[PDB]
Coordinates of C-alpha atoms and ligand atoms in Angstrom, one line a residue:
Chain B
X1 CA 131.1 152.9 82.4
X2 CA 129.9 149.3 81.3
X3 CA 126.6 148.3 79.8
X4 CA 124.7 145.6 78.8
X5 CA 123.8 145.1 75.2
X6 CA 121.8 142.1 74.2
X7 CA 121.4 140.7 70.5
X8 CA 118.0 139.9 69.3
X9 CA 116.1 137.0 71.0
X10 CA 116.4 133.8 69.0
X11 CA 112.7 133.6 70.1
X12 CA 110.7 134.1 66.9
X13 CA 107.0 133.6 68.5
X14 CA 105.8 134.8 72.2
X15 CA 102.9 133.7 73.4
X16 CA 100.5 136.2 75.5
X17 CA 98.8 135.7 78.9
X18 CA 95.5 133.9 77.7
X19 CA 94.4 130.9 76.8
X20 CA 95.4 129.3 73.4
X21 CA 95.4 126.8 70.9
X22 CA 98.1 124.6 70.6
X23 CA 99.9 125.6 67.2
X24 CA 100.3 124.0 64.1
X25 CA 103.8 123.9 64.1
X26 CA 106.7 125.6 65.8
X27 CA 110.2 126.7 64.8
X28 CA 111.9 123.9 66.6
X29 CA 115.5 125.2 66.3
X30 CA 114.4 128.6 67.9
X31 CA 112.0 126.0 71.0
X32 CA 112.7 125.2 74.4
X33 CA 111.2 121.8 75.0
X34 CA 110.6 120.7 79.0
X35 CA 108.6 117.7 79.7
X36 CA 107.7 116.1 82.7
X37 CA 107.5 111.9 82.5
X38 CA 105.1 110.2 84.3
X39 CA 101.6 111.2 83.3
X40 CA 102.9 113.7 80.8
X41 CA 104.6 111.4 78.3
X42 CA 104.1 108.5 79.8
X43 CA 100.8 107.2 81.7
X44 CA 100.3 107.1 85.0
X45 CA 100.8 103.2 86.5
X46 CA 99.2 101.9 89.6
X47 CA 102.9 102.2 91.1
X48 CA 106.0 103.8 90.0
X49 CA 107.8 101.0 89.3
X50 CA 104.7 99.4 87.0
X51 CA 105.0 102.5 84.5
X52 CA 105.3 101.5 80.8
X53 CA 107.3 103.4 78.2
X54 CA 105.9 102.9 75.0
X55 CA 108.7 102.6 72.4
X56 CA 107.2 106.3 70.6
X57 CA 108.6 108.0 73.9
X58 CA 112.0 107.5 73.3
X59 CA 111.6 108.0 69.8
X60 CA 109.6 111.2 69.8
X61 CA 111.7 113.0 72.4
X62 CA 115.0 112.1 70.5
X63 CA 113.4 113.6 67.4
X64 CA 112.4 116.9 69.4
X65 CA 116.4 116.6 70.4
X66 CA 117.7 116.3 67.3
X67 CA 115.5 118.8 65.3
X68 CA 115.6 121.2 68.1
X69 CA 119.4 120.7 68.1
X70 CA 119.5 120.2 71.8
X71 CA 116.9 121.8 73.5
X72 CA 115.5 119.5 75.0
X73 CA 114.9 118.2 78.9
X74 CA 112.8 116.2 80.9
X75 CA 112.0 118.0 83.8
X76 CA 110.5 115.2 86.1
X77 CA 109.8 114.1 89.8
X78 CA 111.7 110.8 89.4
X79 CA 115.5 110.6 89.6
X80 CA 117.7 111.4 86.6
X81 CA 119.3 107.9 87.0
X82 CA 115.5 106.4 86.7
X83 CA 114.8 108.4 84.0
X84 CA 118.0 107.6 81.9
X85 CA 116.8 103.6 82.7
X86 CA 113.4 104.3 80.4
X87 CA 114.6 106.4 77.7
X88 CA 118.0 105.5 77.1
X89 CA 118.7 108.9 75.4
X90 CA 122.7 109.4 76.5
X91 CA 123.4 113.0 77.2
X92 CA 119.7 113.7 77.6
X93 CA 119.4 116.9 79.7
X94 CA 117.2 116.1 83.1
X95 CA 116.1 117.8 86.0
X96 CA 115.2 115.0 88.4
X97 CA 113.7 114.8 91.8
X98 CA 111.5 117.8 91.1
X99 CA 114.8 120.2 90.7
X100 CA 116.9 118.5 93.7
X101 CA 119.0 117.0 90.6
X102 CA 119.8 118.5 87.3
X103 CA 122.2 117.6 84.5
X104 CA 122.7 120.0 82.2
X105 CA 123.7 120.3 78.6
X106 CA 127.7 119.6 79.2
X107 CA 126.9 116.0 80.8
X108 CA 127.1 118.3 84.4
X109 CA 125.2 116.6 87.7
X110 CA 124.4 119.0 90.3
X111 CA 122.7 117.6 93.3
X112 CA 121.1 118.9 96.7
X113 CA 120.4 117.0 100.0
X114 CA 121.8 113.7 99.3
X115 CA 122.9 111.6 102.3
X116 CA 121.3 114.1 104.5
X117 CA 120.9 112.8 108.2
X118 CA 117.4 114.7 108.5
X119 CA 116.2 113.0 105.6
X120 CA 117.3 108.9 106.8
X121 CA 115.4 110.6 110.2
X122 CA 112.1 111.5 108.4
X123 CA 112.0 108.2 106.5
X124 CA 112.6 105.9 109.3
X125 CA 109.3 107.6 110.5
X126 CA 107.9 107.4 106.8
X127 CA 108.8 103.4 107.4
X128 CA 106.9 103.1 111.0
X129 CA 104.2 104.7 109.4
X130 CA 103.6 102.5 106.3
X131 CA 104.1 99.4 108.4
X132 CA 100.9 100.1 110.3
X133 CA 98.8 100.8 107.5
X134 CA 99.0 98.1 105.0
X135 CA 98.4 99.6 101.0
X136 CA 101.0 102.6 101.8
X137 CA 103.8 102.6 100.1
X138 CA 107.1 104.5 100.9
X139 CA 109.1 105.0 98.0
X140 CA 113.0 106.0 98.8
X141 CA 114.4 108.6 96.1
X142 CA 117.9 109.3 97.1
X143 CA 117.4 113.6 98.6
X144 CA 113.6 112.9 98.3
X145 CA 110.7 110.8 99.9
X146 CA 107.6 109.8 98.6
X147 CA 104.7 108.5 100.3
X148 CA 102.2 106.8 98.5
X149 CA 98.4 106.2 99.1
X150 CA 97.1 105.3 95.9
X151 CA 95.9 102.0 97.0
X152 CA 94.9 102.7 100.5
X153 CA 92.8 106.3 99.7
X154 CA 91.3 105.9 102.7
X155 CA 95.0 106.6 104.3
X156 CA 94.8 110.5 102.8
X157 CA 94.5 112.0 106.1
X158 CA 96.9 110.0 107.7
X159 CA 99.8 110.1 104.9
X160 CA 99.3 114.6 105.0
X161 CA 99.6 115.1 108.5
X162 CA 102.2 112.4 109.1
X163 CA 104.0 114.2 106.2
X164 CA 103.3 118.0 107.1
X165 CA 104.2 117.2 110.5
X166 CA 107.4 115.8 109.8
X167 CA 108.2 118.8 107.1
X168 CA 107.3 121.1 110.1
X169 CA 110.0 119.4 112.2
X170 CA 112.5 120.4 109.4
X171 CA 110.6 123.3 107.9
X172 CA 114.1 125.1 107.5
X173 CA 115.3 122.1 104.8
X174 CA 112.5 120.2 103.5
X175 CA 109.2 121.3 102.0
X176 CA 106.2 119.2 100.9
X177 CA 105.1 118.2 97.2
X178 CA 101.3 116.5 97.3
X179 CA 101.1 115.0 93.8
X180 CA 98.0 112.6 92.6
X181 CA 97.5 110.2 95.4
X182 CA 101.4 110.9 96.9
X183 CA 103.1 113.3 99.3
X184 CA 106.3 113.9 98.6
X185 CA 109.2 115.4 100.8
X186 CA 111.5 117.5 99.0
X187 CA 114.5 119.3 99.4
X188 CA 114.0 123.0 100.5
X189 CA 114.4 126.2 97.6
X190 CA 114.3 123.5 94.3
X191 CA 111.3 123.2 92.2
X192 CA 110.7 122.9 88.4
X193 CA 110.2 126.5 87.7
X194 CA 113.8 126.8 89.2
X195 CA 115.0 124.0 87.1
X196 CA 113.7 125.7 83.7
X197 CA 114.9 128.6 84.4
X198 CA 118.3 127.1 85.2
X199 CA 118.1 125.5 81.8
X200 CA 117.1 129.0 80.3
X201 CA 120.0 130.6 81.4
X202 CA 122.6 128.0 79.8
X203 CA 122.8 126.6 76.1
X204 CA 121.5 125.3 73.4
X205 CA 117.9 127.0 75.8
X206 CA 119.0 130.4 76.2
X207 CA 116.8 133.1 74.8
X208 CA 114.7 130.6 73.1
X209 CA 110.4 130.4 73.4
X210 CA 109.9 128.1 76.4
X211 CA 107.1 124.5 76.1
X212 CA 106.3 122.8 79.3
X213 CA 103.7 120.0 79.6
X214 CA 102.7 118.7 82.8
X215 CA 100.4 117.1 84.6
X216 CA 100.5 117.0 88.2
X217 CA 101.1 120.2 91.0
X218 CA 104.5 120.2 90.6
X219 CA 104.4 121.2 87.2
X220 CA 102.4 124.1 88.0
X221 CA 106.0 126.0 88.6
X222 CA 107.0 124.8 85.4
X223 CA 104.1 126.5 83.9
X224 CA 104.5 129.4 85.4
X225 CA 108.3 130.2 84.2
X226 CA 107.2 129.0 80.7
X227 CA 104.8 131.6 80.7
X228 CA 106.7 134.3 82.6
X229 CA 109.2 134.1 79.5
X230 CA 106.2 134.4 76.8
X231 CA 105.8 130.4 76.1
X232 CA 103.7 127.4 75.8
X233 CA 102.4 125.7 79.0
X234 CA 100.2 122.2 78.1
X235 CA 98.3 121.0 81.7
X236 CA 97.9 117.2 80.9
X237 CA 94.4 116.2 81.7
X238 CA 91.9 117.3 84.1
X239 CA 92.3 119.6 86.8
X240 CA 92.5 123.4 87.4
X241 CA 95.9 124.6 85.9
X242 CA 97.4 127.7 85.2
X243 CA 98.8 126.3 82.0
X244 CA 97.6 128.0 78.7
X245 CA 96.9 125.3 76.7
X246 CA 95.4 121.7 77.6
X247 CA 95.1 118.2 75.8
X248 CA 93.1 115.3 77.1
X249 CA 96.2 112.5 77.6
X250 CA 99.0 111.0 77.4
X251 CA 98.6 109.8 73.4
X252 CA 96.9 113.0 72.8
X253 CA 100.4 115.2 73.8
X254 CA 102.4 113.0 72.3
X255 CA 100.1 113.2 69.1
X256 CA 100.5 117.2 69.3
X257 CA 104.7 116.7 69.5
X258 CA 104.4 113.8 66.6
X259 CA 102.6 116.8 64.6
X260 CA 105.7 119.3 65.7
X261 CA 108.1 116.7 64.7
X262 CA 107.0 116.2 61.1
X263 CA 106.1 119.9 60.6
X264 CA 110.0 120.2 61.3
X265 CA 111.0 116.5 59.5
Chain H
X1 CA 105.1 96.4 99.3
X2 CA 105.7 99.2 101.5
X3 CA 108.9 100.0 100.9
X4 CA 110.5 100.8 97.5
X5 CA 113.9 102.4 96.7
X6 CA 114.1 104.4 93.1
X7 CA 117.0 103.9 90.7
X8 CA 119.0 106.6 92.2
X9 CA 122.0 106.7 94.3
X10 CA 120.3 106.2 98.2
X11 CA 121.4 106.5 101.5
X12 CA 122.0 103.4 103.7
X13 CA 118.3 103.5 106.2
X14 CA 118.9 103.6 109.5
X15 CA 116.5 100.3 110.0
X16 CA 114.6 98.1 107.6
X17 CA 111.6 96.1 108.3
X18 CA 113.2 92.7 108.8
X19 CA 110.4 90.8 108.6
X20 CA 109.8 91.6 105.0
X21 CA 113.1 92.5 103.9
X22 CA 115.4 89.5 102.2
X23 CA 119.2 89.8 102.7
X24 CA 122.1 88.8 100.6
X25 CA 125.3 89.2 101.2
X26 CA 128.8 88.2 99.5
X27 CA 131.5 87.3 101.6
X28 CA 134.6 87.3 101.1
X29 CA 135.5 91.3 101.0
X30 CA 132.1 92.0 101.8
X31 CA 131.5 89.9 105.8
X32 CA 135.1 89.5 105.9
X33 CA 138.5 91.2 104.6
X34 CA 140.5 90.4 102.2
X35 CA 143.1 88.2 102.1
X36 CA 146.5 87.9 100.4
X37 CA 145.3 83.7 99.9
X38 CA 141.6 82.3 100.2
X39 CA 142.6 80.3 103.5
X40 CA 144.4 83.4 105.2
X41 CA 141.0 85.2 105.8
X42 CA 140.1 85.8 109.3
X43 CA 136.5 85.5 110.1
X44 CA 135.6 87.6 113.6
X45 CA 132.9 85.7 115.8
X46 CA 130.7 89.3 115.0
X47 CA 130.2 87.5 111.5
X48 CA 128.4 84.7 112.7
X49 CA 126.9 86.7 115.3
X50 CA 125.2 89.3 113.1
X51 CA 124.2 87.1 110.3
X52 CA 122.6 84.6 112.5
X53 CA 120.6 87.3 114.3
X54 CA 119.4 88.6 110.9
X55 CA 118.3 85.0 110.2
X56 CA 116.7 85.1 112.8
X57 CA 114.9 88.2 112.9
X58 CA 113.9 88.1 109.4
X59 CA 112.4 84.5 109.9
X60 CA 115.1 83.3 107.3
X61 CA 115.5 85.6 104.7
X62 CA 119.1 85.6 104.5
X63 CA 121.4 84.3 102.0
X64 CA 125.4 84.0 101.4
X65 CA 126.4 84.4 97.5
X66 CA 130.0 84.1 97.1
X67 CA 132.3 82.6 94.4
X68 CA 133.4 80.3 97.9
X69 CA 132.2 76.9 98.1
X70 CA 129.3 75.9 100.6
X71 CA 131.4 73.5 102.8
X72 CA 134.0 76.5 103.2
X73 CA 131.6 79.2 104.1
X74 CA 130.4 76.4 106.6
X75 CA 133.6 75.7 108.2
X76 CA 134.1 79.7 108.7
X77 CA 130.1 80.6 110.0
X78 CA 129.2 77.0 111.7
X79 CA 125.7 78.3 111.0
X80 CA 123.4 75.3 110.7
X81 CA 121.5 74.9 107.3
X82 CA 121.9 78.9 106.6
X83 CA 120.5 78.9 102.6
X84 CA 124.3 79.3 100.8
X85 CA 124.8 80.1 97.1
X86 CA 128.7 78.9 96.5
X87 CA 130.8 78.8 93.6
X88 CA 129.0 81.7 91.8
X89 CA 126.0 79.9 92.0
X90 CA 127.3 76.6 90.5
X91 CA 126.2 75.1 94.1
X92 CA 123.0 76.6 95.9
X93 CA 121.5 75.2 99.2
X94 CA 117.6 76.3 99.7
X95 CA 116.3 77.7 103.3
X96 CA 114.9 73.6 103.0
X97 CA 118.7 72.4 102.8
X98 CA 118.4 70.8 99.8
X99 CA 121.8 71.6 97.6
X100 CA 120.5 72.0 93.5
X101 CA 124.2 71.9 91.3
X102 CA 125.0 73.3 87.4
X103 CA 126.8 71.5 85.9
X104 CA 129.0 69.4 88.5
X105 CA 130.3 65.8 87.1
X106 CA 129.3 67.0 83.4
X107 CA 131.3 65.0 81.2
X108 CA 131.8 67.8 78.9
X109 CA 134.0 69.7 81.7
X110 CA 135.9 66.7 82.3
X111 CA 136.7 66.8 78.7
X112 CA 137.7 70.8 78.4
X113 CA 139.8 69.8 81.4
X114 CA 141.9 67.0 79.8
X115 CA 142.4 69.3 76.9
X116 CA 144.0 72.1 79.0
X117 CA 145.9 69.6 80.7
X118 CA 147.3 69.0 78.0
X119 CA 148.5 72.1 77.4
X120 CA 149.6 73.3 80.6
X121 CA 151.9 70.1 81.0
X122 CA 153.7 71.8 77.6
X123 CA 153.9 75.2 78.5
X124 CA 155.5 75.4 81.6
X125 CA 154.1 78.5 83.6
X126 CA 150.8 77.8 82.6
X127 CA 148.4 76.8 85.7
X128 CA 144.7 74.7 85.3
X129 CA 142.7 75.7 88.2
X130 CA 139.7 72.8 88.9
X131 CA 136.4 74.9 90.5
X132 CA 134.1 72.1 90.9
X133 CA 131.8 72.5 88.0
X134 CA 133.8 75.3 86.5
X135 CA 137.8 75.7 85.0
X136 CA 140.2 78.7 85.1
X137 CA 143.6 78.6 82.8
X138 CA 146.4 80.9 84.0
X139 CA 149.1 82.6 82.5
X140 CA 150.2 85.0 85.2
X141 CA 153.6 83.0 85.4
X142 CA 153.9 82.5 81.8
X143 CA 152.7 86.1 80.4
X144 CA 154.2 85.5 77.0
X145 CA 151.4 82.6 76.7
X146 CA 148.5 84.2 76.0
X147 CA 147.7 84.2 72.8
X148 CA 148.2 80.4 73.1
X149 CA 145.7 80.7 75.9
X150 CA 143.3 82.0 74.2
X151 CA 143.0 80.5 71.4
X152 CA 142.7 77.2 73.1
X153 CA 139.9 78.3 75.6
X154 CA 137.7 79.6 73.3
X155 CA 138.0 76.9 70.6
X156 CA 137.1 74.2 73.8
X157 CA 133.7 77.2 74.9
X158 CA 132.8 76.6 71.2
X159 CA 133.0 73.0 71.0
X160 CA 130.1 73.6 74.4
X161 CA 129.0 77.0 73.4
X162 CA 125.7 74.9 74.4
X163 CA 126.6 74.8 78.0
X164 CA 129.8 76.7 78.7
X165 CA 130.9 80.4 78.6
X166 CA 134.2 81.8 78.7
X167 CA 135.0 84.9 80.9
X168 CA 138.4 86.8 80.2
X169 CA 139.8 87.8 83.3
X170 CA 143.4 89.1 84.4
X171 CA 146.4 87.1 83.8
X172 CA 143.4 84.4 83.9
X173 CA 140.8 82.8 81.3
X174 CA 137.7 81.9 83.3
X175 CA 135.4 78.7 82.0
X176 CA 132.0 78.4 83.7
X177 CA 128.7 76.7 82.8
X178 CA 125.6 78.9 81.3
X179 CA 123.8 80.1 83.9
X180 CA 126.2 80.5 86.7
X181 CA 126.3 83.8 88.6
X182 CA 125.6 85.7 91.5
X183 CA 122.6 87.4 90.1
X184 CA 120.6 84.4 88.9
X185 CA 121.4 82.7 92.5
X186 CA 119.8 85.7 93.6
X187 CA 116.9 85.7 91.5
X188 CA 116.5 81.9 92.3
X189 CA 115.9 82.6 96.1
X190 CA 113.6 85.3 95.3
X191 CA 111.3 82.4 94.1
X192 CA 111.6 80.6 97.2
X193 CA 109.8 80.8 100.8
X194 CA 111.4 82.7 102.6
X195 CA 112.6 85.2 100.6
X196 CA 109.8 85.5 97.8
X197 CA 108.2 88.5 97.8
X198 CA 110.2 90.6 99.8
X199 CA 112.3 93.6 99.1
X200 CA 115.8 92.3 98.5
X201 CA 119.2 93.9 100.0
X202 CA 122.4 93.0 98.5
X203 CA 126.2 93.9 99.3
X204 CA 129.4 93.2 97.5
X205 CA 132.5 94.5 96.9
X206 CA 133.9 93.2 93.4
X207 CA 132.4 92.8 89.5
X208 CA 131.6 89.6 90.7
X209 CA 128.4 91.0 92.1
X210 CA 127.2 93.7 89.6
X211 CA 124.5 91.5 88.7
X212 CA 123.5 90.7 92.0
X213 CA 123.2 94.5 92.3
X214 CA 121.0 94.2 89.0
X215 CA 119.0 91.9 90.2
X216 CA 118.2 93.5 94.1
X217 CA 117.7 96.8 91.5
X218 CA 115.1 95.0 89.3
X219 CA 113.4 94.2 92.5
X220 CA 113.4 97.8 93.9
X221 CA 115.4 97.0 96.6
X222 CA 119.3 98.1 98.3
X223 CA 122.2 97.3 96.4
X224 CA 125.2 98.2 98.4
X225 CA 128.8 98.6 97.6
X226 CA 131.5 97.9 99.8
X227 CA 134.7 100.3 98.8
X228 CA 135.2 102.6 96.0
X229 CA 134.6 101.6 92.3
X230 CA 132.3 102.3 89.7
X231 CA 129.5 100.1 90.6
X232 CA 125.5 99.5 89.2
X233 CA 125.0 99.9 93.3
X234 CA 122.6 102.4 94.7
X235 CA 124.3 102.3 98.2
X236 CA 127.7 102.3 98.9
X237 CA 129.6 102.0 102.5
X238 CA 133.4 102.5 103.1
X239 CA 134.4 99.6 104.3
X240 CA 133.7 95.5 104.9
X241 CA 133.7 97.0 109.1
X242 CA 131.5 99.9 107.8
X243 CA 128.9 97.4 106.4
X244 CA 128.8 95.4 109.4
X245 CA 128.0 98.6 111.0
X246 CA 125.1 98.9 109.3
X247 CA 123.5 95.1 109.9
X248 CA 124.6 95.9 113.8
X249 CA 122.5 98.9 113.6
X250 CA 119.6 97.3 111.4
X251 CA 119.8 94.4 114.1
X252 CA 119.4 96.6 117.3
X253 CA 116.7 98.4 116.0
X254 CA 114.8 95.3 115.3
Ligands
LIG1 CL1 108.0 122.0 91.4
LIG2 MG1 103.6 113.9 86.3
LIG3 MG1 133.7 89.5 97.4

């Protein structure tokens, strides 16, 4: 009785499931553009708060935005609100907090596990913790937790099973995130991959060829949509990565969007 | 160190480490409801109570920062040598006791005053209010006046633009000295023993203390709202009882 016709895919290139070379150039109004911040387009500081956003960040990304017409989102594990505070791009779409917050294109703010009572629990064992182990840091990100060991690496063991074990005690809500030199504490049945493919399925992303650069674990799920849908996926630096295509740093990703950008205009 | 909140709405902790947390706290509408005139507030004995036990506790990392004078928050909290910032900051007493002033017995105030006299004693419904080191001309009873009265106050924050701002407010034209609000009092303790160093908490109710918000932000630290209103805040709580809730709580579980 009803059926489901489709029209063409405004995706003009696909990808296959190998390696590859980062192209040339790409038809940016027909692109899907999903970055992660820290270490991605920005370097990674000694402490969140000590991060600095060169002034090409902003510029570059609102480039992609306008040349893209749109289609373009940070897809971070800081908070929309933080990233809004270093770009300054109004109406930017964001998926913060590793999915647990997403704006989308319409200016919309969906959010998951704020104000839960299980989470002001876990961190006021986070907070115990960190005040007998001096070098820890416990950062506070609204649904999220992160727990820091960057400058106290001898604290690794201590920060994963003080985080597992609390994650176990709430295993029905709250899942764990280990990043580089972090744990964090995340709600449950969000991630990145769940994020792009949220964007995916809403304009101006629909139906278009998917790039997402990352960095860090979290963004492996980001890779993994991008190349579920036949697109780009840049790992950041070193590590095994199930990302097509990798650059060396920071400057050498945003070189590789510069060279998109003027390709385009 | 330790303990860092994100730019991002948060959640009001169940405890903080008191020892390295610095507190500051607006009062009126923020310690203490508001009142239909400044002298009909009614301060509970739990005011005193609480604050002084977080003074304590926090081995003097606590701070009043209200647009009250000093010698009024004194006569309502009796507590001894408690570091106040009063007037918006015009008048700030150090966790030493010493009381640093901006602007107080400037002869350039005295001046704008004598001009507004002057023209309040012609337009009858016209009110010059005298803050200390700051002036506010009022029109509330005289609404078909404003134009005069603004004309006049900014030509007098020109003649001073130096050393005087003017702050539109309503029914009201506000003139304080440069550097004169809630968020550089804040700031200043923050490079002062006790409080340098720590992570800063901050509660206040009105737009009076967006920038004290700002500057707990800056310092990744708890801005808290009391009430509803848009607000730079990452915390918010319902109510000024609400948010002595919270220091209760903060208290016992030291
Ligand atoms: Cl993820
Ligand atoms: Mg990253
Ligand atoms: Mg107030």
């Amino acid at each position: 009785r009803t059926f489901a016709r489709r029209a063409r895919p405004p995706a003009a290139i696909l990808f296959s499931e190998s390696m590859q070379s980062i192209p040339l150039s790409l038809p940016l109004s027909r692109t899907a553009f999903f970055f992660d911040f820290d270490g991605t387009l920005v370097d990674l500081a000694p402490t969140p708060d000590a991060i600095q956003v060169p002034p090409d960040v902003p510029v570059l990304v609102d480039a992609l935005r306008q040349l893209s017409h749109g289609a373009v989102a940070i897809v971070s594990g800081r908070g929309i609100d933080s990233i809004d505070a270093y770009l300054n791009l109004p109406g930017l779409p964001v998926a913060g907090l590793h999915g647990a917050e997403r704006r989308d294109a319409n200016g919309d703010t969906q959010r998951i596990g704020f104000d839960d009572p299980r989470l002001l629990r876990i961190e006021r064992e986070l907070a115990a913790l960190v005040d007998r182990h001096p070098g820890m840091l416990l950062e506070i990100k609204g649904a999220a937790l992160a727990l820091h060991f960057r400058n106290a690496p001898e604290r690794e063991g201590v920060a994963r099973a003080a985080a597992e074990r609390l994650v176990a005690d709430y295993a029905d809500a709250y899942v764990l995130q280990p990043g580089k030199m972090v744990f964090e504490i995340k709600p449950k049945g969000v991630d990145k991959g769940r994020a792009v493919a949220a964007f995916l399925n809403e304009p101006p992303f629909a139906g278009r060829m998917p790039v997402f650069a990352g960095d860090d674990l979290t963004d492996e799920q980001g890779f993994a949509v991008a190349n579920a849908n036949g697109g780009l996926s840049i790992k950041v630096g070193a590590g095994d990565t199930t990302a097509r295509a990798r650059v060396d740093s920071v400057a050498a990703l945003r070189a590789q969007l510069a060279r998109w950008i003027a390709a385009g205009r």
